[PDB]
């Protein structure tokens, strides 16, 4: 999981930065359509928290990839395709949250820790949004088309975050290399104001 890679990055950053940081501060140590929709809402609300649903279960993550899910084959093809389109957002969220929670450790240095902390804060805002959508579903205010529409921006944000995480992990960017990677990513998001 992204958490294991981020923790390894933390240990590496701690050693390299300690050699770099002359400052003596040591790092801290058959279902009805409505019933199918309801079951899928429960599964998605679990997947957004990284929990397998009753009808939608997560597949094991192979490498630094987004989490894959197993969907019941008996779901509507249109529903199944919408689920597979939205599930990428929850997988990206889970990977970003794991990386954020691990690399926010002092061993990763203030730059990587702050980057992970910011990712965690944005994941928290996303989770707040998702909880409000879950409430709307409990209120009956969440439709499948409304769900798809609401997750589309969340899907794009999560996909951008997952692409950034995978780029940082492939480049093993740390410190000044991490700052260079951040600059390059900021140039890569020239078309995405958010």
């Amino acid at each position: 999981s992204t958490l294991q890679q981020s923790l390894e990055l933390k240990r590496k950053m701690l050693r390299d930065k300690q050699n770099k940081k002359n400052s003596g501060q040591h790092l801290p140590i058959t279902l009805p359509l409505a019933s199918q929709e309801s079951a899928v809402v429960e599964d998605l609300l679990y997947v957004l928290v990284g929990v397998d649903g009753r009808y939608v279960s997560a597949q094991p993550l192979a490498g630094r990839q987004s989490r894959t899910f197993l969907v019941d084959p008996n779901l509507d093809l249109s529903i199944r395709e919408l689920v597979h389109r939205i599930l990428p957002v929850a997988a990206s969220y889970s990977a970003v949250t794991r990386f954020i929670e691990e690399k926010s450790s002092f061993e990763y240095g203030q730059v990587n820790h702050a980057l992970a902390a910011a990712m965690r804060t944005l994941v928290k805002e996303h989770l707040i949004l998702v909880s409000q959508l879950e409430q709307l579903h409990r209120q009956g205010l969440l439709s499948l088309q409304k769900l798809w529409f609401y997750i589309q921006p969340a899907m794009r944000t999560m996909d951008i975050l997952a692409s950034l995480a995978t780029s940082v992990d492939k480049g093993e960017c740390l410190g000044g290399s991490t700052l260079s990677l951040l600059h390059d990513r900021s140039f890569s998001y020239t078309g995405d104001s958010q």
């Binding site: 501060q25 040591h26 790092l27 801290p28 679990y46 929990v51 002092f106 928290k124 989770l127």
Partner: protein, 180 residues
Amino acid sequence: ITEAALVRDILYVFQGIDGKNIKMNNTENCYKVEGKANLSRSLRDTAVRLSELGWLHNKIRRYTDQRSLDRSFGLVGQSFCAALHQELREYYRLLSVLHSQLQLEDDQGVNLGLESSLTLRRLLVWTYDPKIRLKTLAALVDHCQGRKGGELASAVHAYTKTGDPYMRSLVQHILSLVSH
């Protein structure tokens, strides 16, 4: 299993008490949900998440009990134990506040599909940052385990470099209190 019973069990686990349907699994050092079939796998994962907090609470309390009785910890050791107890008091205040909010949600009785309703997912979100704080404190305790006096002071100085700004501020305050 009613959601309210799970809420009660999770609030007890935050206090280190086994719930009616969630009991401490000593093998996992976490509260385990009783094997009644009707628990959702998502609900099970949420229970595990809360039991991580209960495990941290129990670890902190074990440490506090182990060191409050040790006169040999010296004035620096006693100050460190006092700081740990003070942080535990703040944590217990937070847990009490969360319990009171859950009680307010129970008292209102309405499954209001409003964004403000206390859902198990909303509870998990609201305790995520507290969970991170408690995880940081437990890791610090583990790294500081067995250290006292100047070794504790050295560990505290090392702990001031935490990357989490909230954790960084907390560790700075703890360092200042232990250095006093």
